[PDB]
Ligand binder design. Structure first.
Ligand code: NA
Ligand code: NA
Length: 262
């Protein structure tokens, strides 16, 4: 037999690449990590944090979810499945948050960054809620480059699990904004082959995925088993030589290992 952290090490060994995991069981405070303090490229997982920062502006009376943002075809960057349909007519701030979170729409994220004040404003938001580790440096789509050894646009699994707990289950947002943020992650459409695929069917998942260069596949989540306190799980996987479906399977296996331990 072996501890969960040892099981994750064996998963890493047979999969190749570099795997980072942090888990927090909020019932007990049980915490476990594997490469929990190493930096990993966030890729789209930052969009959960971006939406939170926007909601904090709403909480402060500095932004409105129903504000309509009009843009142009010149704004469209790689991978924008929702915003590329709304150059005509635009989209509201809420719709952009939903697109960014549930479809990993890259232009939506840039438009929300523009509304917020950019990557330094998002990073400042994170410092203000006690995350001294996570950093957004670039805009879409360059922030997905995921160069090994590059500290730009990175987090650690422990920092991200702590931040996601703070945002979805903590004091950072108003009750209404916290509910809205949870709502968006519960509605995610990009995660069915990742953590969700390894968890029992009646566990409820709110998650945000990330995908990038140098074989990067990520998934961060708050998970509610039936009639039980939530578990926060952050998974970062990079420097893999495996194809996208195989990397999804690595994350799904982390989910299964977590479900078999907890
Ligand atoms: Na910790
Ligand atoms: Na593939």
């Amino acid at each position: 037999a072996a501890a969960l952290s040892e099981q994750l090490a064996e998963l890493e060994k047979r999969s190749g690449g570099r795997l980072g995991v942090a888990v927090l069981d909020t019932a007990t405070g049980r915490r476990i990590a594997y490469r929990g303090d190493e930096r990993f490229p966030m890729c789209s997982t930052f969009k959960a944090l971006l939406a939170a920062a926007v909601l904090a502006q709403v909480d402060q009376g500095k932004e409105r979810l129903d504000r309509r943002i009009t843009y142009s075809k010149a704004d469209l960057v790689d991978y924008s499945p929702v915003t590329e349909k709304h150059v005509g007519g635009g989209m509201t701030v809420a719709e952009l948050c939903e697109a960014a979170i549930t479809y990993s729409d890259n232009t939506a994220a840039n438009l929300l960054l523009e509304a917020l004040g950019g990557p330094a404003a998002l990073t400042a938001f994170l410092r203000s809620i006690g995350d001294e580790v996570t950093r957004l440096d670039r805009w879409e789509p360059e922030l997905n480059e995921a160069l090994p050894g590059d500290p730009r646009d990175t987090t650690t699994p422990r920092a991200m699990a702590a931040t996601l707990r703070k945002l979805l289950l903590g004091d950072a947002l108003s009750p209404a904004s916290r509910e809205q943020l949870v709502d968006w992650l519960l509605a995610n459409k990009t995660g069915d082959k990742r953590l969700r695929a390894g968890l029992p069917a009646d566990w409820r998942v709110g998650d945000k995925t990330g995908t990038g260069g140098h074989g990067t596949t990520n998934d961060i989540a708050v998970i509610w088993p039936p009639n039980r306190a939530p578990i926060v799980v952050a998974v970062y996987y990079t420097e893999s030589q495996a194809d996208a479906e195989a990397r999804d399977a690595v994350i799904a296996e982390v989910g299964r290992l977590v479900a078999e331990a907890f």
